[PDB]
Each structure stands twice: as structure tokens, then as C-alpha cells.
Amino acid sequence: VERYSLSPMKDLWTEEAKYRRWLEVELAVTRAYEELGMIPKGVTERIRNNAKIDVELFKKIEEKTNHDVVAFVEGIGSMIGEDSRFFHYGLTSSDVLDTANSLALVEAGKILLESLKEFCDVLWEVANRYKHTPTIGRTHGVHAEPTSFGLKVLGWYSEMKRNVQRLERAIEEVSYGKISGAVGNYANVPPEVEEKALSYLGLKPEPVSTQVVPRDRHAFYLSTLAIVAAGIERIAVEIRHLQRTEVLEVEEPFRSAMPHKKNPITCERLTGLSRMMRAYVDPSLENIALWHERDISHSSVERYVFPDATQTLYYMIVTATNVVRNMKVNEERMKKNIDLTKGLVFSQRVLLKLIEKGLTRKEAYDIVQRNALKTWNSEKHFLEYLLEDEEVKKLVTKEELEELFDISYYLKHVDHIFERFEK
Amino acid sequence: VERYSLSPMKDLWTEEAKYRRWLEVELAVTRAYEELGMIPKGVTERIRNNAKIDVELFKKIEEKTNHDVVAFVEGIGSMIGEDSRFFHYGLTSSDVLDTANSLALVEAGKILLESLKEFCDVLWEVANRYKHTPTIGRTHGVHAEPTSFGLKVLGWYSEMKRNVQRLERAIEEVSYGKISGAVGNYANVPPEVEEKALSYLGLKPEPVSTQVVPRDRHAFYLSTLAIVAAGIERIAVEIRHLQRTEVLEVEEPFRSAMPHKKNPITCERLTGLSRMMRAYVDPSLENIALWHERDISHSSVERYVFPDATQTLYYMIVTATNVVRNMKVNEERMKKNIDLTKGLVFSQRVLLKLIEKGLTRKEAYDIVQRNALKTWNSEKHFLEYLLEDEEVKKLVTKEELEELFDISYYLKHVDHIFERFEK
Amino acid sequence: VERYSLSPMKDLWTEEAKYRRWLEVELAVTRAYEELGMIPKGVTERIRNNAKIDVELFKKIEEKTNHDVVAFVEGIGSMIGEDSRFFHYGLTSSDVLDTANSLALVEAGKILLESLKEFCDVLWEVANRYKHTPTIGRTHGVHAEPTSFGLKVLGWYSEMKRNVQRLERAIEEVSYGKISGAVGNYANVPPEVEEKALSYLGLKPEPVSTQVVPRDRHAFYLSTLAIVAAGIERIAVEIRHLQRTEVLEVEEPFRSAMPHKKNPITCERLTGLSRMMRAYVDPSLENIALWHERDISHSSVERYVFPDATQTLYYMIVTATNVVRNMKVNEERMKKNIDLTKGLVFSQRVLLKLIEKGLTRKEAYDIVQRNALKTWNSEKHFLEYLLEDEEVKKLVTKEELEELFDISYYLKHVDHIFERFEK
Amino acid sequence: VERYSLSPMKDLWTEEAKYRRWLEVELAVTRAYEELGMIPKGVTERIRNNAKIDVELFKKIEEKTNHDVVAFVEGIGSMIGEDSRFFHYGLTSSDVLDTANSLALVEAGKILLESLKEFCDVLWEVANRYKHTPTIGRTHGVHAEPTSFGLKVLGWYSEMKRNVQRLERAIEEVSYGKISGAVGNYANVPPEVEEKALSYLGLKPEPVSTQVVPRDRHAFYLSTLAIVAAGIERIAVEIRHLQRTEVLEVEEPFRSAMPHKKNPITCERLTGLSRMMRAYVDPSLENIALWHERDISHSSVERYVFPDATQTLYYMIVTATNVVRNMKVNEERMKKNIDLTKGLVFSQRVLLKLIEKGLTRKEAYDIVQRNALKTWNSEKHFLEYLLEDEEVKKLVTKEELEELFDISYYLKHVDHIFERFEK
């Protein structure tokens, strides 16, 4: 794990950061009471001045207390003297816990969103750089028709922009806390305190909560994270295919190294991390069916999944940004790979042209097949066989024949497509 | 499976419905060409009049062809005579396949959305009916504080309304087809044909496609379906708990039956179907990383998951609607269950009241604990013990003591919460 | 789905086959009571002669009964006259259901196991056929060191022989039924009736059951099935890579076709079916935690998973067997692919030889790197560059150089490895 | 995570313990070469005396090397002087990595297995302690028929004894390393060195490896781990249900506490940890299909799963053992809960007795239903209503009636079932 904790994301998930979120919540709540005239003026400022985050103290108290937030509430109690009457007043532990996890997931979502937007900018730049670079399109791993390498990157760009909007909605979904007390009905803490306290944190009130924020929001967020990761996985698998020794179209950045031993190690790592990101979706979905007004089975799951899902995805986005930013792209090898089958890429164009000139689907098909076959089993090109085919010679001119091998045919609509992403 | 195929949803997924979607696509495409002046006037109308869906013919041709859409294209070919020149013109098979699955998933999404909205109306009605019905709030399966049964149903209502908006976005995500030919670059079919043909189907053009519509859209849709199902699972588990013999607060509708043998069979079934819905998420997510401009590994997955996920969820929503619509709710038993622990539900109120009147947290706590203990181990009530406690007798009046047992305390903010959902 | 239902597996999962298993269970149970003297002599043969599988009757009765096994018990009841006193006597529904599913899963396991052993025989045959066929070993998709193609097939053989054993244990695990009545404590049917009835069916008694056979047995079985599928998935991904245009070492069987358009469609299908097989594992694992002496949430999951997992794996085994049996293996291409990097595959042998002859690891490495580079960026071979390197010329003879390019170094232990599988 | 790392399991997964396993592998390999006469006598002891685990050195070298095992090989190299010629000789990195992970998973398996056997001993003890404790059996959460509480614990015992055996096979499955070099064909290190080196470590040779030990072995192991976890999850959900306020039959150990606020927090935790354990299964299964002779996508997954799955299960086994060892069992409450429905638990015996005495199934059923109804809606017992029923009065004696309410009918075979586990 520590392998991919990267700053800013990993600073979110220390024990200090967590206790500071709990204090933030507690201070928003005393502030809300005080602004409503419900506790004396001055309480919040004094608790702000005297409450310190002391991790060892809270952990020592927790040894005796066996309860994380009660230990915190007493630890803070021992620094704030008389003001402890007004601290954690009416709250249940999950008011603090779940509001603090909204804070963390919203912030993690924002870090993720900024790095994602940055991945989009790099993908847009790389797609425009190779906008007109010819490459062979491949279906079932088999040469199909010519295309451009910028258009392939644009498909990745297109997918990551759908993920920017998805990530914005997942941030919205998790932007809800609760300050509603034991079973969520404001018996011990007024709903006006909740509304003020959460607006100071940048959060909204869960419209109806139980003891807990409903876990379908978290499952939505984490399902969105797994889908972002699988798009990065699609990119990573492409580059693994393109860096294989028989292809050599692209090379992921590295580190003088042996030219024949450049392994796509980073993209293999990305593929494995995507497997982990989708692994967290299932446990988040059966966190949803909590018993009544809550059970705590989700808590242990979330200790793994919140920190690991958001730190792994962050590492995936930053790493894949660097891979696409700095990968070597071998344009001449791309172009050369179009001629690997020696013209047989243009074999549909040749087939149709024989139907145009009179022949029936089957008639044309047999002429192309025989030429294909000879091309495939030898060293001469498809075109050179077609030109010498007598049946072809009485139906098609030679200038007609040669123009069917123009790559620009496959390429006439690339700008049309790029233009859909402009402006 | 056939157990839960219900009309309208199951009519979507027959072989006839599929072939009709393929014809719909094909007709939108000839229409687009003809409206653009690219094929003669009259072609579409004549293909519309002569193309019949003949499932046995297509399947017989497929025996020879070994390819589903080629067999279809030839079957239709044999009915439409000369017009077959202009039919399926420039298309790749996945233009038809994936555009037809957008049609199916958008329509399935709309059927699902209407039944979901209807579930929301029933939940809103049931929540307002029991708005002020007292029930005991339960955390860790343990009596916590009083609450209202309408507020519990409102939490379900709140969750299903978040799922209506989620379902709308999932319908949007899947509203994209492609008419872009072999590797998605319009080499064989102009992008103006795509744009016209898909607007007649109510769909949008994938802004950049490969041979296929990118599979992250389908994974998003199906992840949303699994989250809707897990909310239905939360409801179903609640009712199972509430129909157990020691609780008897709610009874799912059934079918004169034995009163002691009413089993929550439907809600158990709902819980199992939610397990299947979340099971489809993982295969949809590794459908995303297709090789290059496509591989066909996703096709076999989607033969299971599109029809099964959308028919299971539809059955879940209709069944859970009926369960909530017609379930028996035992209000007097709910109210009686509040007094099961004989007043000990109000034990925090009693504790705080002793701190108010001078005592320290620990001092108060020991008085409540001893009374709790005596109450727990006997048949007299908490209140009756408190009244006779001397330490309590010198700190608290008896009218003070009795008012701490008012249920209306737990209940002062129920209308505030319901009002968040009005208007 | 129907796409891959293949005889004999799909005959297991009809409604008829299910009711036949129910009767088989019922007849074993009457036989057991009769042999113990608990019901009159002759009952079992009479019920055997009279009791007919009438699917439409049972479904008509179920319309009114709303209970599948009750409807069956009554339908059989209407055919067997006075002997209905002795039929289904003391049983709970899940005595019949779960015992019938053990029969099905055992027999499914056996059909799976015989096709698997047959897949092993084909793998052994193909591996021995290419025992000594040179091929380039590939790590990270990059040419590593020479090996044999039979050795690669052997690793697949070794994996499926581990699965044969795993399948035999999974059969063992599911060989347990129950005839123990409502909560599994033999209050209504004697344990000696259970023991006799299940030994007639070839099954063992769950040593302690509740109302149900414990679902960890089924989860273990389905987990083993998903493991077998992923080994098929490893094989199918190798053939996809090897059939790509730039590689052409292997070609899956098909159907005269275009030589350049041979797509690995069956293998991509096998990949997608492997994803469904692993998807069924999670739902099976959470069927395990049934509430108390049972809930029925697992029933609905098992209507999908039992038939779908066994039929999909059966399809995968039979199809992969035909793929490996009939695939074309291009040996000259495999041998030719070793020289793609023009000798650089032997570059570690060259490096070590320079350390042998005095040089330090870094010294040797720089000579190899420079020659590698020159080879990589040109058309001359590594050897030709080494021979002309003066630093190399004074440390190594030419005959010492050339013999580092012998493939038989890489193959000396092929024969030791096959030997481990013999006898 | 650190929450549940417990000695001895967490000592397995430090960086130090990992480098120690790497050295252990390296020393087995030098020992094997030396015993075969291939390197001078004395090398192994010298490398043993000199080779120190220096985590910070290896990490500093790795900063420059960017390769974990290379950095290790060099760091050891700087301590062992001239013997570095003989160290790591012919090995590929994954000879050390995968052999070291077999050591770890074997030893983890053994720690797991000893705590599991200990969980079985506690279960056997608790089951025998309540062998004859009457309790109500529950199906669909609804009172069914009386049984014994020891019988329920026996079913848990039976499940964990099946897991002991499953754990022994999973240990066997992962007992394979490799010392076969870059593509697993012993080109660079002899197979007799592998055989000797692995028998010193207690391991067997993968019969054919590629660059890596095949990942179906690890997926089988982790699948067995998730099965063991779900059986713990079945137990923990039972204790949650039994500790609910309306039931009070059992109370998990804790920490004087409030008697009404005893929450089943450990059991809810065990439930959530079971969800993480099953989440690791899917990522392990798709690690299986590595490309060719390996890709490294699995490495990153295994950095999470190996340590997390073995430590979480270890925590679950030890904690569930303490739960079952120390939980309070309320026998009088269990016995009292049988009479909750005031005799209606014996209603099938009454029904059958009326058919015995002449009546038809429907006739008998209506008498029982009417009395059931009256019992259900009042405070008088079923028996008292039956005795006063005139139709009952003319078919059944009072002593014939009362003895249908004997609990020993339900318990006669408890003793036969425990006997199956003896000896």
C-alpha cells in the first residue's frame, strides 16, 4: 500500500487528520448553538483556543474507554475546562464520524477531480499532436482499417471527460453530513443546529438520517471510482499491447537501458490497481442494508475502502497522466504497421469496386480472396496481384485500382470528430 | 429466471424484439441517407413495406452464416429485392448491435423509472399515514430511542428518490448509439448519416466511437441498477426483522392462514435478487477494457446481464411496491414495543437531569445504572424505582421525573423533517 | 444463455428433470421407511408405478398453492391413491429441494469432470506434439528467452490436472443431502430413514443440518467452478495474443475465408464466459449466512447460479477442447519469431561471457548495450556487431560467440519437465 | 487495518520478514548448488554469516535501482564479498518473490489452521455444554419447532471442521515454489538445484512453471479463506439476532454497564470483515490469466491481498473464538422463548393427531386454525382452547392432548447427532 500513498491524498488519511476533522465538526456544532443563542457567547472561540489534537492522549484514553469518539470527547474535555458542558452536546458518535467522512470524501473527491482534469488536458494535447498520425485500427487483435492515433487517444480523452462529470456527481452524493443525534430525529439536538453547523463545513444536511448517513451515497461514490479506474485500465492495456515486441508503436516512460528489454511495468501495475478498485465496489454495496437505524458492520469495511480506494485511484490518475504525457510514440512504425499485410487492409474497397463494376457479391469476393491468398502466402503485394488479374483488368483501370490504397480515405472525417470536443 | 419476467420488461428481451430493433436501426440509416440525397427517394418506404421480421428464417440463415447480423441482413435482403444495395450500407455489425442495445437499455430504463416513481408515491403515502405512529428506534438491533414509523418509511422514500435521479442519469449515459462503421471513423458511412439516423431513434451519437460504443456507459448503468436493488434490499431486511415472532410490527402481504406461520418469503426473495443485481456489476466493469478498437468478450456477458439485470430489478421494484402498499402495520404493537424494557429507553433523559441538578457525570450515571439493573432483573418499571430512590428524591420532583417519560420529546421535529420533502 | 446449453448438461436443468429428482428423493424415502418396517410392504413399488411427472398439473396446482413442493406433493397425491399417507411423511420442503440439488450438482460435477479429463487428454496430446517446437518466451509481452511450445501447452495441461482434482473435491463437498425434517433434528422423520434414503441416492447425510443443507458446500463448489473457468480464460487469452496480426503463431478453428481476417472469436467468447463464472462466486458466498435454521434468500440466487454456472462451464470446457484440438499451430512462424530482435534474445549469454572472461558487470553491460542499440536501430544482426567489436574480439573467440546463439541451451530440460507428468 | 493486525500473523508481513524470506530462498539455492558440487564447499555458511537484513540499505539502493529484488541482491552483494559470484546465480526475480510468497502463505496457513482448530475445540465445548438446552428453532425469522442450543452450536462446529480440512488443502495448494529461471525451463539454473533448494524450505517444485508460479494456486487459497470468513459471518449474524432486545438469548462478551445497552459490536465487526474477505476473491481470480510467461499485474494486487486476507481472517478466528468462549447464554430465556406463541409451536402435532383420529387434512386444519387464531388474539394458551373445543373433545382425550405439548418429542435425536462427531 504505502508504495502509492502520494501527497495531498495520503495527508487526508492519517490519524491526526481524522481527529482534526472530528474537532472541525465539533466546533461547527458549538458555533451553530452559539449563533442561535443556545449556549453563551465566547464558548466556541475558547474551545478553539484550548482544544489541541493530541493523538497519543486520545489513544491512551481509548485503551481505557474502548471507544474512539468517547476517548476523543474526554481528551478534548480535559483541555477545555468548563466549556465541556457545551461540547458534543446532544450528538451521537456517528454525527461526528459520518460528517467527518463526508468532509474527507468530498476533499478526496476534489483532489481526484483536479488530477483527473489534468489527465484530460494531457490526453487532449496528445490527441491533437497525433491528430493526423496514421495507424492501423485493430478489431479482435486483427488488422482492420486505417485510422489515426490521435483519434484513439481522443476516445480516452472522451472517456475521462465523462469521468470528470461522474466524479462531480459522486462528490455531490457524498456532500451530506448529519447532526441529528441518536436515531436521527433531532430529539437531542435541534435541526437548526444541524443546518447551520453543516453549512459552515460546506456540507448539506441528510434530509432524513437514522443514526447514520445512508450508505447508498458511499456505494455510489465508490462505484464511480471503480469506473474511473477501469478506463485507466483500458488505456494501460492498450499501451501494453502497443509496447509488445512485434508491435513497438508506443513506449511507456522509464527510469542507458537495453532497447529490447523495455517492459510496460507501469501499465501492468495500473491494470492490477484497477482490479483492486473494482474489488471495493461489492463490499460498499452490501454496506447499504444496515439493520434498522444502523448496525456498525460498515465501519470496518470503510477503514479499508475509503483510504485505499481514494489513494489507489489518485495514484492511478497521476501515474497514467505521466505515462501519457511522456510515452514515446513511434509514428513511422505506426505507419509501417499499416503495410504489414501488404495491402490487404484495403481489400474491402477492392471488393466493393468489383460489385460497382457489374459483379455480384460472391463474384467479386472470389477474385479478392484468391489475390489475398497469394499475397498472404508470398512476398508480393496485394496491388501487384490485382493489376495482373485478368478479370480485374477488364473491369477496373489501374489508376482506379491504385487509388483504393489511399490512406486518406480512412481519414477524411478526423477533423469533424475532433471538432465535437472544441469550444 | 422466468419466475420474474414481467410484462412490459420481458417483451423487450425476446428474439423478435431484438430483430425489430435491428430493423429500426437499419430503417433510420436508410432514411438518413435518403433525406441527405445520397440514395434515391422511395427506398426507405419500400424497405419498410417489404422487410418482415421472420425469426425462423434469420435463424435458419444463421445456421449457415454463423453470424447473427449477417444472417439478418441477408434475410432482409431476400425480401427487399433491388433496395438491398442501399440496406446496411457502409455499416459494421456493431453499429446495429450497440445502437439496438442503447434502444433496449433506454426503454428498459424508462420502464424501470416509471415503476420506481410509482414506488416513491407508495412510500410517500405510507410514510404520511404513519407520520406520527410511535415506534422504537433500534441501533445494533438494540432498543435505542423512540421515533416514528412514518419517519423510518420516509428514509426509504428519500433513498428511492435519490435512485429516481440516479436512474435518469443512467438512462442519459446509455442514450448513445453509433453509425460509424468498422473502426468508428466514418470511412464507410458519413457522420451526417449517423447524426440524422440516431436523432430519429431518440439517441445521440457517441462523440468518438471505435468499432463499438465504449463499455463504461453500460457499467455505469448497471452499477446504478445494483444500487437501486440494495436500497430495496434494505427495505426487505427491515420487514424481515419486523415480521419476526418476537417483534410482530409489520407483516408482508400474502396469498385462512395460520397466524403464527406468516413468513416474510417475498422480502427474503428480494434480498436474494439484490445479491444477483450486485453480482452483475463486476463483469460489466471488466467489459470496459476491450482490446484496441474492440474485442467481442463483452457480448457473451451482455447476453446474460442486460436482460437479467433489467428484468430482475423491474421485478424487485414492482414486488416491493406491492409489499409496502399492502403490508399490515401493527401500530399498537409498535407502541407497546417501546415499553419492552419498562422505561429504560428514557434512561439518558434521567441521567442528564441529575447532572442538571448538580451531580457529576459519574455520580448521575451510578444512580441510573442501579435503577436500570433492578428494573432489568424484575417486573417493576424504571420510573417506580426512580421515585423511591432517595438520592433521586432530593434532587428531582416527581412531576419532573414523570415528564422525562413523555414520548412527545422524541417526537417534536417529525414535521420539520417531512416538510423537507414537500412542495 | 441458450446459446451455450449443450446436452447432457442442459437436460439436467429442465422443469421435468427437477420434478424427477423430487420423486427420486420421495421414493428413496418411502423405500427407507418400508425396509425398516415402518410402512407396509409394497408401498414404494406402487408409488413408483403410479407417480407420473406431469409438469402442467404441478404448475396448475401451484397457481392455487403458491408453493412449488406442496403442489408437487398434492399432484403426486392425486395419482397414488391410499399410499399418499406414506408419501412425503415427516419431511420439510428443503429435505426434497436440497437433496434434489445435491443430486443435480453431483451429476453436473460428473459431466463437468469427464469433459475436463477429456480436455486434459487433448492438452497432453498437443503438448507432446509440439514438445520440441522452439518458440520465444514472452514476459510483460516482450521477447525474453527461447522455450518450447509444447512446454507452454504442458503448463495448461498441468493447470487442468489440478482442476480435475479440485473438481473431485467439489463433487465430494456437494454429495450431502438431508432427510431430517423441519429444523433438522429428526423430530418428524427418523435419522435411520435419512441414512437409508440417501445411500440409495448415492449421497451422504449432512451430519448436522438445520432446515437446509449448509450453503458453504455450494459456495465451495462454485468457487472451484470459477477457478476452472479462469484457467480456460488463461488459455483463451494466450490464443488471442498468438492469433494477432503481428504474431500469427496459432489460429483457432473456424467455420474459403480471407486469410487476413481470421478473428479469435471463440476465445474472446471464452474470456467473457469466464467473467460470468467468477461473477457467480460472490452471491454464493453470501448465501452462506442464512438467519437461524434458515431463510429462503438463497433460493432465488440458486435458480440462476446452479444451472448457469454448470452449463456455462460445461460449454467452456467442450469449446476449449475443440479449440485446442483443432487450432492450427504455425511452427515456422514460431521459430521465425525468435529472430525478430535479430539475436538480442541471446544478449544475457553474451553479457555473462564477458564477465567470465574478466570484465566486471558494468564493463560487460556497456559493450552489450552498445551492440544492442546498433542492432535495434538497423538491419544487421547482434552477432555481426559483436564479431566486429574490438573489445569483444580480444576477449572472446568467434566460435565462442556463435555458440551463445544456440537454441539448444534453452531447450536442454524440456524433456525432464515432461517426464514429471509421465507414469 | 492496524486495528486487527495480531501477533504472530502481523510479524509475517513486515518488510524485514519479507527480506528474511528472500535470503532464506537465496541460501537454499546456494546450499543446493554447493551440495551438488557446482560451487565451492563453504560458500553457503559464509554467506549465512555475512548476509544481514538491512532494510534501509535495500530501500536506499532501490531508490537508485527502481527494482526491489535487484536492490536486495546488490545490498547482500556488498556484504558477502567474493561469494557474490555464487549468489542469486541463474535466478529470475520471481524465483525469489514467488518462493518467498509460498513460504509466507504456507506459514500464514499454518497459523490460521492452529487458531481454527482451537476455534473448533471451543465450539465443541460450548455445544456439549448446551447439548440439552431447549431453544426454539426459527425459519424465516419465525418460531418453527423446538430444538437444542447445543445442536445449533454443533452446526457451527461442523462447518469449522469442514474449514479445517479446506484449510489443509489450501496450504497444500500453495506449497509450491520455483527455482527455474527466466521462463521456467531451467536454461539458467538446473532442475536438481530447484528440487534440493525447495525441499530445504519444506516446499515442492511447480512441476512446470513459467516465469511465475501459476496464480490459480493463490486464488484457490484466497477462495478458501473467504469461505472460512463467511462461516464466521453466519455465527456472528446469529449472535446479533439472539442479542436483540426482543430475544435476549445470548450476549457477546464485553469490556458496570447498563443492562439494556449491550450492543453486539464485535459480531457486527466480524460481519463487515467477512465482506472484505470475500471482496479479495475476485481480484485473485483475475490474477490467473497472466499474459504468456507472465505479466506483473498481479504483484500490486498481492501487496494488498496476501497480508490483508491472512491478517483479517486471523483476527476473525481469534475474535470469534473469544466471543463463543465467553458469551453469556441465557438458558431460561431460551426456554421461555419457546412459549412466546403460547403452545402454537406444537400446532402441527395437534393437526396430525386429528387426521390420525379420522379427520381429513382440511377438516383437521380448520379446527387448528380457529384455535390458533383465538390463541394469537388473546392471552389464553392453545391447549386451553383445544381442551374446550367440542369437535376436539370427541376425537382426542385430554391426556392425548397434553402430551403433544411435550418438548422431548423434538429432542429425542439430539444425542444420535452429537454421536456422529465423536471418536
PDB file of N, CA and C in Angstrom, chain A residues 18-19 22 57-75 88 91-97 211 294 296 303, chain B residues 140, chain D residues 3 255 263 265 269:
ATOM      1  N   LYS A  18      -7.815  12.781  10.881  1.00  0.00           N
ATOM      2  CA  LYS A  18      -9.115  12.325  11.310  1.00  0.00           C
ATOM      3  C   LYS A  18      -9.619  13.048  12.561  1.00  0.00           C
ATOM      4  N   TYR A  19      -8.772  13.060  13.609  1.00  0.00           N
ATOM      5  CA  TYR A  19      -9.081  13.812  14.803  1.00  0.00           C
ATOM      6  C   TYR A  19      -9.294  15.288  14.501  1.00  0.00           C
ATOM      7  N   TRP A  22     -12.816  15.561  13.265  1.00  0.00           N
ATOM      8  CA  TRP A  22     -13.753  15.477  14.387  1.00  0.00           C
ATOM      9  C   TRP A  22     -13.867  16.772  15.174  1.00  0.00           C
ATOM     10  N   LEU A  57      -2.590  11.106  23.523  1.00  0.00           N
ATOM     11  CA  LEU A  57      -3.576  11.191  24.599  1.00  0.00           C
ATOM     12  C   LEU A  57      -4.875  10.496  24.235  1.00  0.00           C
ATOM     13  N   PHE A  58      -5.464  10.792  23.073  1.00  0.00           N
ATOM     14  CA  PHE A  58      -6.719  10.142  22.692  1.00  0.00           C
ATOM     15  C   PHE A  58      -6.538   8.627  22.668  1.00  0.00           C
ATOM     16  N   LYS A  59      -5.460   8.097  22.096  1.00  0.00           N
ATOM     17  CA  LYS A  59      -5.218   6.651  22.070  1.00  0.00           C
ATOM     18  C   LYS A  59      -5.020   6.066  23.459  1.00  0.00           C
ATOM     19  N   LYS A  60      -4.312   6.743  24.358  1.00  0.00           N
ATOM     20  CA  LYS A  60      -4.253   6.285  25.751  1.00  0.00           C
ATOM     21  C   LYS A  60      -5.642   6.256  26.358  1.00  0.00           C
ATOM     22  N   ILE A  61      -6.476   7.288  26.160  1.00  0.00           N
ATOM     23  CA  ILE A  61      -7.814   7.261  26.771  1.00  0.00           C
ATOM     24  C   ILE A  61      -8.652   6.141  26.167  1.00  0.00           C
ATOM     25  N   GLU A  62      -8.457   5.891  24.886  1.00  0.00           N
ATOM     26  CA  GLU A  62      -9.171   4.837  24.186  1.00  0.00           C
ATOM     27  C   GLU A  62      -8.822   3.431  24.683  1.00  0.00           C
ATOM     28  N   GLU A  63      -7.575   3.238  25.134  1.00  0.00           N
ATOM     29  CA  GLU A  63      -7.224   1.989  25.822  1.00  0.00           C
ATOM     30  C   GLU A  63      -8.212   1.749  26.964  1.00  0.00           C
ATOM     31  N   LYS A  64      -8.508   2.750  27.788  1.00  0.00           N
ATOM     32  CA  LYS A  64      -9.461   2.559  28.871  1.00  0.00           C
ATOM     33  C   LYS A  64     -10.911   2.582  28.415  1.00  0.00           C
ATOM     34  N   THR A  65     -11.234   3.429  27.448  1.00  0.00           N
ATOM     35  CA  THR A  65     -12.622   3.723  27.092  1.00  0.00           C
ATOM     36  C   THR A  65     -13.159   2.647  26.163  1.00  0.00           C
ATOM     37  N   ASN A  66     -12.275   2.021  25.386  1.00  0.00           N
ATOM     38  CA  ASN A  66     -12.623   1.172  24.260  1.00  0.00           C
ATOM     39  C   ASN A  66     -13.573   1.759  23.228  1.00  0.00           C
ATOM     40  N   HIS A  67     -13.534   3.055  22.973  1.00  0.00           N
ATOM     41  CA  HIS A  67     -14.460   3.730  22.064  1.00  0.00           C
ATOM     42  C   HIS A  67     -13.778   4.970  21.530  1.00  0.00           C
ATOM     43  N   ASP A  68     -13.597   5.033  20.228  1.00  0.00           N
ATOM     44  CA  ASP A  68     -12.769   6.072  19.626  1.00  0.00           C
ATOM     45  C   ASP A  68     -13.345   7.456  19.887  1.00  0.00           C
ATOM     46  N   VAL A  69     -14.648   7.703  19.705  1.00  0.00           N
ATOM     47  CA  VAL A  69     -15.022   9.128  19.773  1.00  0.00           C
ATOM     48  C   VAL A  69     -15.224   9.525  21.222  1.00  0.00           C
ATOM     49  N   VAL A  70     -15.683   8.612  22.074  1.00  0.00           N
ATOM     50  CA  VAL A  70     -15.758   8.949  23.504  1.00  0.00           C
ATOM     51  C   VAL A  70     -14.380   9.321  24.028  1.00  0.00           C
ATOM     52  N   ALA A  71     -13.333   8.549  23.747  1.00  0.00           N
ATOM     53  CA  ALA A  71     -11.989   8.933  24.156  1.00  0.00           C
ATOM     54  C   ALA A  71     -11.625  10.335  23.674  1.00  0.00           C
ATOM     55  N   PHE A  72     -11.866  10.626  22.399  1.00  0.00           N
ATOM     56  CA  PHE A  72     -11.663  11.982  21.869  1.00  0.00           C
ATOM     57  C   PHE A  72     -12.425  13.037  22.651  1.00  0.00           C
ATOM     58  N   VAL A  73     -13.720  12.813  22.886  1.00  0.00           N
ATOM     59  CA  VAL A  73     -14.551  13.778  23.600  1.00  0.00           C
ATOM     60  C   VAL A  73     -14.025  14.023  25.007  1.00  0.00           C
ATOM     61  N   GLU A  74     -13.646  12.994  25.779  1.00  0.00           N
ATOM     62  CA  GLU A  74     -12.950  13.195  27.033  1.00  0.00           C
ATOM     63  C   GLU A  74     -11.572  13.846  26.922  1.00  0.00           C
ATOM     64  N   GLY A  75     -10.762  13.483  25.925  1.00  0.00           N
ATOM     65  CA  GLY A  75      -9.463  14.091  25.783  1.00  0.00           C
ATOM     66  C   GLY A  75      -9.667  15.587  25.619  1.00  0.00           C
ATOM     67  N   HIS A  88     -19.987  18.639  22.126  1.00  0.00           N
ATOM     68  CA  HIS A  88     -20.564  17.310  21.838  1.00  0.00           C
ATOM     69  C   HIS A  88     -21.930  17.218  22.490  1.00  0.00           C
ATOM     70  N   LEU A  91     -25.112  15.124  20.663  1.00  0.00           N
ATOM     71  CA  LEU A  91     -24.675  14.395  19.492  1.00  0.00           C
ATOM     72  C   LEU A  91     -24.601  12.896  19.744  1.00  0.00           C
ATOM     73  N   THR A  92     -24.755  12.101  18.703  1.00  0.00           N
ATOM     74  CA  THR A  92     -24.344  10.695  18.778  1.00  0.00           C
ATOM     75  C   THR A  92     -22.987  10.566  18.112  1.00  0.00           C
ATOM     76  N   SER A  93     -22.237   9.483  18.369  1.00  0.00           N
ATOM     77  CA  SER A  93     -20.908   9.389  17.790  1.00  0.00           C
ATOM     78  C   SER A  93     -20.910   9.500  16.267  1.00  0.00           C
ATOM     79  N   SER A  94     -21.871   8.855  15.596  1.00  0.00           N
ATOM     80  CA  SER A  94     -21.944   8.894  14.157  1.00  0.00           C
ATOM     81  C   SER A  94     -22.292  10.268  13.592  1.00  0.00           C
ATOM     82  N   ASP A  95     -22.896  11.204  14.338  1.00  0.00           N
ATOM     83  CA  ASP A  95     -22.853  12.589  13.849  1.00  0.00           C
ATOM     84  C   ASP A  95     -21.450  13.087  13.513  1.00  0.00           C
ATOM     85  N   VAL A  96     -20.480  12.873  14.393  1.00  0.00           N
ATOM     86  CA  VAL A  96     -19.094  13.209  14.150  1.00  0.00           C
ATOM     87  C   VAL A  96     -18.430  12.317  13.109  1.00  0.00           C
ATOM     88  N   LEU A  97     -18.494  11.001  13.262  1.00  0.00           N
ATOM     89  CA  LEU A  97     -17.900  10.055  12.339  1.00  0.00           C
ATOM     90  C   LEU A  97     -18.313  10.255  10.893  1.00  0.00           C
ATOM     91  N   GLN A 211     -29.447   6.815  12.756  1.00  0.00           N
ATOM     92  CA  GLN A 211     -28.196   7.080  13.487  1.00  0.00           C
ATOM     93  C   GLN A 211     -27.043   7.410  12.541  1.00  0.00           C
ATOM     94  N   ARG A 294     -29.297   1.516  12.478  1.00  0.00           N
ATOM     95  CA  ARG A 294     -27.955   1.268  11.969  1.00  0.00           C
ATOM     96  C   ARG A 294     -27.423  -0.013  12.651  1.00  0.00           C
ATOM     97  N   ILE A 296     -23.109  -1.515  12.990  1.00  0.00           N
ATOM     98  CA  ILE A 296     -21.802  -0.937  12.701  1.00  0.00           C
ATOM     99  C   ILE A 296     -20.963  -1.816  11.803  1.00  0.00           C
ATOM    100  N   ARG A 303     -12.893   1.436   6.948  1.00  0.00           N
ATOM    101  CA  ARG A 303     -11.498   1.621   7.346  1.00  0.00           C
ATOM    102  C   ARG A 303     -10.571   1.132   6.243  1.00  0.00           C
TER     103      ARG A 303
ATOM    104  N   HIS B 140     -27.831  -1.387  16.399  1.00  0.00           N
ATOM    105  CA  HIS B 140     -27.209  -2.673  16.739  1.00  0.00           C
ATOM    106  C   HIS B 140     -28.244  -3.725  17.114  1.00  0.00           C
TER     107      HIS B 140
ATOM    108  N   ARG D   3      -5.670  -1.773  13.518  1.00  0.00           N
ATOM    109  CA  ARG D   3      -6.760  -2.334  14.295  1.00  0.00           C
ATOM    110  C   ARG D   3      -6.736  -3.848  14.464  1.00  0.00           C
ATOM    111  N   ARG D 255     -16.178  -5.378  27.246  1.00  0.00           N
ATOM    112  CA  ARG D 255     -15.288  -4.583  28.075  1.00  0.00           C
ATOM    113  C   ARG D 255     -13.890  -5.209  28.092  1.00  0.00           C
ATOM    114  N   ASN D 263     -24.524  -3.971  23.174  1.00  0.00           N
ATOM    115  CA  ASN D 263     -24.644  -3.986  21.714  1.00  0.00           C
ATOM    116  C   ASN D 263     -23.715  -5.055  21.161  1.00  0.00           C
ATOM    117  N   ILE D 265     -21.389  -5.465  19.013  1.00  0.00           N
ATOM    118  CA  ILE D 265     -20.422  -4.661  18.259  1.00  0.00           C
ATOM    119  C   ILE D 265     -19.342  -5.546  17.662  1.00  0.00           C
ATOM    120  N   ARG D 269     -18.744  -6.110  13.643  1.00  0.00           N
ATOM    121  CA  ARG D 269     -17.390  -6.013  13.111  1.00  0.00           C
ATOM    122  C   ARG D 269     -17.014  -7.276  12.329  1.00  0.00           C
TER     123      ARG D 269
END
